[PDB]
């Protein structure tokens, strides 16, 4: 159930896993925050995440559970 609870834990999970890397955290917020501004397109949001969590499946997967069939996530080898 993608609700405020699912989004809350996700953030807390991304903060702990990247406790030694604040850059990654700040990057995720930028993508979402940038989207709210209505400037960055969808493909841009999934792209950043797909690159931000290149070595984190549980991350790219957790977010994938939110995106609809329309805008899915890709894993560039």
């Amino acid at each position: 159930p993608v609700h405020v609870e699912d989004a809350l834990t996700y953030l807390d999970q991304v903060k702990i896993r990247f406790g030694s890397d604040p850059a990654t955290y700040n990057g995720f917020l930028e993508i979402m925050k940038e989207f709210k501004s209505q400037s960055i397109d969808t493909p841009g949001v999934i792209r950043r995440v797909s690159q931000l969590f290149h070595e984190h499946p549980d991350l790219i997967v957790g977010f994938n559970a939110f995106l609809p069939l329309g805008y899915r996530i890709d894993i560039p080898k």
Binding site: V2, V4, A7, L8, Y10, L11, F28, L29, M32, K33, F35, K36, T42, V45, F66, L67, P68, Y71
Partner: peptide, 15 residues
Amino acid sequence: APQLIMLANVALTGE
């Protein structure tokens, strides 16, 4: 994407 708007909202103000 309503899930994208809720995601940024909780990140910008989730408390």
